[PDB]
Design a binder for these strands. Sequence first.
RNA 1: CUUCUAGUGAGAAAACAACUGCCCGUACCGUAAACCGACACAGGUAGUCGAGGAGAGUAUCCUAAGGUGAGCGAGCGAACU
RNA 2: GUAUGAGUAGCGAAAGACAGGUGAGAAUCCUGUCCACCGUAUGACUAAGGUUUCCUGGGGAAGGCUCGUCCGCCCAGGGUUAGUCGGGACCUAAGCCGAGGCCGAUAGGCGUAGGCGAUGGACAACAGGUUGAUAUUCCUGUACCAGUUGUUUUUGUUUGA
RNA 3: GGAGCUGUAAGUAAGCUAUGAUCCAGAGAUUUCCGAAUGGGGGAACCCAAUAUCUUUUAUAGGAUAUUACUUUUCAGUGAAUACAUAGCUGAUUAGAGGUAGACGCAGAGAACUGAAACAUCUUAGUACCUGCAGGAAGAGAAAGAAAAUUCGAUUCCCUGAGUAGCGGCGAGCGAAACGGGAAGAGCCCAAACCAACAAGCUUGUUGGGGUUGUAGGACUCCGAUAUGGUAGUCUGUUAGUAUAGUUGAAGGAUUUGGAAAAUUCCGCUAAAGAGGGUGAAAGCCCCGUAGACGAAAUGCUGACAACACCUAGGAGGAUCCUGAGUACGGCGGAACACGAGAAAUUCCGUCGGAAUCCGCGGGGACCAUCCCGCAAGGCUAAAUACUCCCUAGUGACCGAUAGUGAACCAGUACCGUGAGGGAAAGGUGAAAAGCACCCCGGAAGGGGAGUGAAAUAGAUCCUGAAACCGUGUGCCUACAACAAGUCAAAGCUCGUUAAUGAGUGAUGGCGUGCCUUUUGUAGAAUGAACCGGCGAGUUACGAUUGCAUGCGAGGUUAAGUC
Lengths: 101, 91, 59
Amino acid sequence: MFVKKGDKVKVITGKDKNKEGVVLAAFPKQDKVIVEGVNVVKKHQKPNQAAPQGGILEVEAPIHVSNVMVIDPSNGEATKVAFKEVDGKKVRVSKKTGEVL
Amino acid sequence: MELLDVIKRPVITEKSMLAMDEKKYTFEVDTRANKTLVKQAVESAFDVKVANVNILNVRPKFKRMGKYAGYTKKRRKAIVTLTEDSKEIQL
Amino acid sequence: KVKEIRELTTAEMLDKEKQLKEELFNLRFQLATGQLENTARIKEVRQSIARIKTVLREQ
RNA sequence: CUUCUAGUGAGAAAACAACUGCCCGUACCGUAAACCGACACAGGUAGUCGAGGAGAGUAUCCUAAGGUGAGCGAGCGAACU
RNA sequence: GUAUGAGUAGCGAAAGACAGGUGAGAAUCCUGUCCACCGUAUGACUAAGGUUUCCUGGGGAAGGCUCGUCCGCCCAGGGUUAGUCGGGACCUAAGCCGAGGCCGAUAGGCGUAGGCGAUGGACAACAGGUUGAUAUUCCUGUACCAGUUGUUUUUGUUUGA
RNA sequence: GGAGCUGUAAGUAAGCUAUGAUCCAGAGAUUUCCGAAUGGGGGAACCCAAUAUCUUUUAUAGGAUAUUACUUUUCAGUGAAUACAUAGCUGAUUAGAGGUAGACGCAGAGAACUGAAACAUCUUAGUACCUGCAGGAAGAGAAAGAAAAUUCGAUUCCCUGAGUAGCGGCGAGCGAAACGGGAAGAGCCCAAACCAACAAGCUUGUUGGGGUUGUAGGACUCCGAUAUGGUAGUCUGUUAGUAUAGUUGAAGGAUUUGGAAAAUUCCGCUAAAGAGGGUGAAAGCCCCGUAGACGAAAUGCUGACAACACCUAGGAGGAUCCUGAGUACGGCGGAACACGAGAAAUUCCGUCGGAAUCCGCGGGGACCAUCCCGCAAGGCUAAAUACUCCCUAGUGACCGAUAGUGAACCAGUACCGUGAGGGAAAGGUGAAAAGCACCCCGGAAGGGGAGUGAAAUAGAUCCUGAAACCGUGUGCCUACAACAAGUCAAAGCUCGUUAAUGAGUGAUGGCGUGCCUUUUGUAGAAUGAACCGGCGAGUUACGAUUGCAUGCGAGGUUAAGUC
Ligand SMILES: [K+]
Ligand SMILES: [K+]
Ligand SMILES: [K+]
Ligand SMILES: [K+]
Ligand SMILES: [K+]
Ligand SMILES: [K+]
Ligand SMILES: [K+]
Ligand SMILES: [K+]
Ligand SMILES: [K+]
Ligand SMILES: [K+]
Ligand SMILES: [K+]
Ligand SMILES: [K+]
Ligand SMILES: [K+]
Ligand SMILES: [K+]
Ligand SMILES: [K+]
Ligand SMILES: [K+]
Ligand SMILES: [K+]
Ligand SMILES: [K+]
Ligand SMILES: [K+]
Ligand SMILES: [K+]
Ligand SMILES: [K+]
Ligand SMILES: [K+]
Ligand SMILES: [K+]
Ligand SMILES: [K+]
Ligand SMILES: [K+]
Ligand SMILES: [K+]
Ligand SMILES: [K+]
Ligand SMILES: [K+]
Ligand SMILES: [K+]
Ligand SMILES: [Mg+2]
Ligand SMILES: [Mg+2]
Ligand SMILES: [Mg+2]
Ligand SMILES: [Mg+2]
Ligand SMILES: [Mg+2]
Ligand SMILES: [Mg+2]
Ligand SMILES: [Mg+2]
Ligand SMILES: [Mg+2]
Ligand SMILES: [Mg+2]
Ligand SMILES: [Mg+2]
Ligand SMILES: [Mg+2]
Ligand SMILES: [Mg+2]
Ligand SMILES: [Mg+2]
Ligand SMILES: [Mg+2]
Ligand SMILES: [Mg+2]
Ligand SMILES: [Mg+2]
Ligand SMILES: [Mg+2]
Ligand SMILES: [Mg+2]
Ligand SMILES: [Mg+2]
Ligand SMILES: [Mg+2]
Ligand SMILES: [Mg+2]
Ligand SMILES: [Mg+2]
Ligand SMILES: [Mg+2]
Ligand SMILES: [Mg+2]
Ligand SMILES: [Mg+2]
Ligand SMILES: [Mg+2]
Ligand SMILES: [Mg+2]
Ligand SMILES: [Mg+2]
Ligand SMILES: [Mg+2]
Ligand SMILES: [Mg+2]
Ligand SMILES: [Mg+2]
Ligand SMILES: [Mg+2]
Ligand SMILES: [Mg+2]
Ligand SMILES: [Mg+2]
Ligand SMILES: [Mg+2]
């Protein structure tokens, strides 16, 4: 996937549009990703998971990868990603600035 | 087959524990292993002396989960009785 | 690992295979009881034996 | 299996002690609710044992050992079958 | 797919009664007592066949012609121990296969040697005990059959057992 | 290739991974048992052996490894009746067995229903089935040919000839070929004469040379050339390309509705990319892609280059020799040729008889003469052609869950049958499980709240949710009535619409025997339908003919095929 675990991304579509967060987990097979504090859901858990209250837990659910854009770390803006080989290493580059990653 | 491959695992059940009290131990063994081979394998593995080995074949047992039904794998059970004046097998 | 195996000699390889077989035997017994914790160790040992046999055959 | 020689032959026999002896089946039903009959079906299913009184008898009636009370019942006590 | 017939036919040979218990719930499950039925069987063993239906602990959706707390049902564990029993490492009958071989548009048909093939022949262990479930299989006691090693004892080593 | 991964498949549990995992492609290792199954046996996936080596035990028992089927080829040794021999036997060696792709090819064997309006000749049909052999294609193929325009020059296949010539109880039907136009193209080897050698018994077999044909060729004898060209050969390399993973690959933000924007609106931008798919609704610019550019360690495939290899002679003479024998051909009996014995050639099978050989032989549809054409009884040969179980990439005025494969789903399954064999049903929550924590009735099931959600009358029997069928509520009517159940007329009561000389119900009165099929005639006591839903019957191809229409018009038009 053009996005990777731990990247800073911007949500471009969905109820959480314009939110930003770090990628907590990636699912290449599903082409989905989890962004902290994004797409939070209330889940009615039984107390069977070492939680002696069950309660209504809050957890981020995955969103489709195409609904996010990687944050240009040097500029802080969302950008599309090109692939340029630098020093013999294939790396991502911000099309808006040319910055790496 | 390799002697180490002859014996698969012990059998722990109420019947097998009662047998242990009499100094006979139950092992699942390769289905192609004859009791003479089982005797040799037990001796090499545990340094004990075997008095007798009683072998029996456990038929595959029918099981089913949800829409699917099949049979557990067939097993071969051998009850090995050690001689007196012999070390016990520790499990 | 494969590098270590290739370094070993033939007799060393055979003895290492015997030790691995005995270790696998003990693992089976421990799993049958509740005495085994690192269950993945069983597959690791099986793969190690397979590697040694493959190297032996490729000598 | 027992004998006979032909062959074969440097070891034999006895007692004693210790020791060795593989694979497959072994559960359960089996004049049946588990088998053959689409059924937990008044049918069919080889062989063995199969007691006592009266009795020729395994007939017959009532019983022993043993097994069972039958997988819809409660009333009413009409026609009709 | 759903009606009508219709809440109708039927609920598949026969005796059950009550007390107590269990349980949300009992004519139907458990226990007890009496009563009743089969008894050349409806008892006890076995072969085939079935293939886990066996035992233990749970369950009451569906199956059980009612009910169900229960089941040959569902769920989870567990249960079949052999030198001597039956079969194989023994023998053959009918029949079958069949090296070569004979015959034949093809395919193949037939058949010798040789084999296979029990329902038959041959063949060494019984009594008691034990488990919830196995027992001539496990255990106790006392045996037998085939063979190996070894000690001892006799006797034969090539006119040689 | 570069960050997660340990399938479906959640859940734990334990782990792996930048020392590069998972994953993708090439190559290789392992690959139990059954199965042709092949050490022997056997009721497939099991049992029991022999030999040799090794292994466990003090030792027997036990374990591992290798070999051990049958037939064929070649070789060697042994070796009967029997003397030599041969046969048998043993060993070694050799290559076969079996399965397919329900397709395509060739061959052996070979139906019936059906058609003929019956039926036997005939037709179905050399079809279906069975069996053998195959190859990627097969078969055919290098003229004893087609012809008679005078010529053509192997074979195959397409168009055309043509529904013609013909065959046919001259019925029903069956039905060519040549010429012409195309696809593709390629020609070559032996036998024999004769020569050299070898061996035995002047010939006679082996070997090598020789030679290959119809305007006759060849031997043989003379001459002259030792070249010139070609190939349908090779796990021979070298090289290129290609197949099997991949890398790169442009351009959008806002505003309105919304749970969510890709939709709306406003300004932009990209395009060798506006194919397509996905993304919370419909995206050229968010993602995967596409246009385009680039890429292979390894292994195949193709093509070139080279190498090696194999073929490749001209002229003149005929004195003599050779040029395919139990053959061609004939009688008898069948069969194939469109041709059914017919006037019947030509081809083939069985049986019997049985030639010539260059002044020779065969054919030109009985047969003969003349003329023309060819040279059998030996072999091989690519391309055009047929088919698709499979693999890769796509396409569709093809299906869209009773359709489309029987099978969108764990289907040749469940189930049925002794067996061959027959053979189903069954797709959809939501964008995301966020799959209803907690509380309440209840033993549970199931509900009511409370929550999630845009929506729960989307709650897992989950999208939509028709009709039959079942039930609750009620506005009108109904217990003196004989009813194909309606329609026409109508009081009363109730209600107020697509606002229309409205709607529901309806006392009462008039008239009035369903629908369909099949019949001279059916309410019919003739047939069919239990009801509801879905599915369910004049189509297509090739020809004939007519009408209409268009183009051209004494002309009209191309077919195959090439791009
Ligand atoms: K038993
Ligand atoms: K008596
Ligand atoms: K009696
Ligand atoms: K009952
Ligand atoms: K009554
Ligand atoms: K009566
Ligand atoms: K009904
Ligand atoms: K009814
Ligand atoms: K119970
Ligand atoms: K036995
Ligand atoms: K017997
Ligand atoms: K076989
Ligand atoms: K095919
Ligand atoms: K016929
Ligand atoms: K007819
Ligand atoms: K050919
Ligand atoms: K025609
Ligand atoms: K006719
Ligand atoms: K030549
Ligand atoms: K998107
Ligand atoms: K799109
Ligand atoms: K290559
Ligand atoms: K003819
Ligand atoms: K001719
Ligand atoms: K000719
Ligand atoms: K809905
Ligand atoms: K109503
Ligand atoms: K009326
Ligand atoms: K009638
Ligand atoms: Mg046994
Ligand atoms: Mg028993
Ligand atoms: Mg019965
Ligand atoms: Mg009685
Ligand atoms: Mg009635
Ligand atoms: Mg009854
Ligand atoms: Mg009687
Ligand atoms: Mg029971
Ligand atoms: Mg129970
Ligand atoms: Mg019930
Ligand atoms: Mg016996
Ligand atoms: Mg035979
Ligand atoms: Mg034969
Ligand atoms: Mg006996
Ligand atoms: Mg018992
Ligand atoms: Mg790698
Ligand atoms: Mg075999
Ligand atoms: Mg006819
Ligand atoms: Mg081939
Ligand atoms: Mg792009
Ligand atoms: Mg726009
Ligand atoms: Mg003919
Ligand atoms: Mg003839
Ligand atoms: Mg002729
Ligand atoms: Mg000529
Ligand atoms: Mg060809
Ligand atoms: Mg279907
Ligand atoms: Mg539908
Ligand atoms: Mg179907
Ligand atoms: Mg709705
Ligand atoms: Mg619905
Ligand atoms: Mg009146
Ligand atoms: Mg009235
Ligand atoms: Mg009539
Ligand atoms: Mg009817």
